[PDB]
Design a protein around this ligand. Structure first.
Ligand SMILES: Nc1nc(=O)c2ncn([C@@H]3O[C@@H]4COP(=O)(O)O[C@H]5[C@@H](O)[C@H](n6cnc7c(N)ncnc76)O[C@@H]5COP(=O)(O)O[C@@H]3[C@@H]4O)c2[nH]1
Ligand SMILES: [Zn+2]
Length: 358
């Protein structure tokens, strides 16, 4: 526990780097919001509130940042890419929109949208003269256009259609927070927009470049900051839970494991979204603030680690919002690599976590 307090103390020692670093990110992002609004399609574009540093800037890892550009898109009609409960075709309600230039039938093409997004951004980068910034569009069908700044700091930018209609059927039994946050809050949250991002649905070898995927990062941000059964959790000397510290340690335990196997990238498919998602399932499972007292940090950390282990062991980690979307299927992650991480976390848990030593 005091070993873990030590670990949290160290992480705090870099709270000011990711302060100044994030101020660069916010600075560049604003340049983009200007040029994109000039375009007719992306006219009503704006920043989505998903991050802690500077209100729109999310931190996934040290020196990795994350921004969502939301775009209001009236009259959405969804067609599920069937049996893949998170992936959707997108249609307008038949009568005209400016997004017209991206249709492929009755369908809004994701990659067609993504392509113009990119040329607009790549064009602003080829113009700015103060800083050296570059493009890194590399990874496997990601919706993220990724900028790199002064060879140190990297930003994921995501286009996000905003639908203000009722969440789709695949989320009906998701966001199971009624025991934790309340039936009341779940109705409030599920009244809020949802977002579609242009991560395409695989077709085996390639993709289906007209399919979007659901996102709820703004809900994730809210249930992280408004995290207690008590409405006054973490607001006074008497209600200090360790919920946020427990998510930080989990994210950090994954990053340290990832460095140790930097040789062959044996764990490269694991992700802080996996640790976050699993941490939400624990909160659902332990709903009371009494179950996250601050002086019980070591116990709470174990609770998080075992459920993660169990998720790796069972090859099942449900998306928090779409219960039939299994982030740990073999569609997505090989049997072999999940075995790998179970062995290394199991050992880490059984020996007071030597990965956190000096
Ligand atoms: N900035 C950003 N926002 C996204 O929504 C997102 N979705 C994918 N990616 C990247 O595309 C690639 C494809 O991974 P896949 O989608 O098959 O599994 C993903 C994805 O299902 C899930 N995930 C990550 N972010 C989100 C998110 N905001 N909403 C839902 N699921 C997410 O966790 C898995 C690990 O992905 P990452 O390894 O962290 O980055 C992925 C990866 O590079 C994203 N990058
Ligand atoms: Zn709290």
């Amino acid at each position: 526990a005091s070993k873990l307090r030590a670990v949290l103390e160290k992480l705090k020692l870099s709270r000011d780097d990711i302060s100044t670093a994030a101020g660069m990110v916010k600075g560049v992002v604003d340049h983009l919001l200007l040029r994109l609004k000039c375009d007719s399609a992306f006219r009503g574009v704006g920043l989505l509130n998903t991050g802690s540093y500077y209100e729109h800037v999310k931190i996934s890892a040290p020196n990795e940042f994350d921004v969502m550009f939301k775009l209001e898109v009236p009259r959405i009609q969804l067609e599920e890419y069937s049996n893949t409960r998170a992936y959707y075709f997108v249609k307008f309600k038949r009568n005209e929109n400016p997004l017209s230039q991206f249709l492929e039938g009755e369908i809004l093409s994701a990659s067609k949208m993504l392509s113009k997004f990119r040329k607009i951004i790549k064009e602003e980068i080829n113009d700015i003269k103060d800083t050296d910034v570059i493009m890194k569009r590399k990874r496997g069908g990601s919706p993220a256009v990724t900028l790199l700044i002064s060879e140190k700091i990297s930003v994921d930018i995501t286009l996000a259609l905003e639908s203000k209609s009722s969440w789709p059927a695949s989320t009906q039994e998701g966001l199971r927070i009624q025991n934790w946050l309340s039936a009341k809050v779940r109705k409030q949250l599920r009244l809020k927009p949802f977002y579609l991002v242009p991560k395409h649905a695989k077709e085996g070898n390639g993709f289906q470049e007209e399919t979007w995927r659901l996102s709820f990062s703004h809900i994730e941000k809210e249930i992280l900051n408004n995290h207690g059964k008590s409405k006054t959790c973490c607001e006074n000397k008497e209600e200090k839970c360790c919920r946020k510290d427990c998510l930080k340690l989990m994210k950090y335990l994954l990053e340290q494991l990832k460095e140790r196997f930097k040789d062959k990238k044996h764990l490269d498919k694991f992700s802080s979204y996996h640790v976050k998602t699993a941490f939400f399932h624990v909160c659902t499972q332990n709903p009371q603030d009494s179950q996250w007292d601050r002086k019980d940090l070591g116990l709470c950390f174990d609770n998080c680690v075992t459920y993660f282990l169990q998720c790796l062991r069972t090859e099942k980690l449900e998306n928090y919002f779409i219960p039939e979307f299994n982030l740990f299927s073999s569609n997505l992650i090989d049997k072999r690599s999940k075995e790998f991480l179970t062995k290394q976390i199991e050992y880490e848990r059984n020996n007071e976590f030597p990965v956190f030593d000096e």
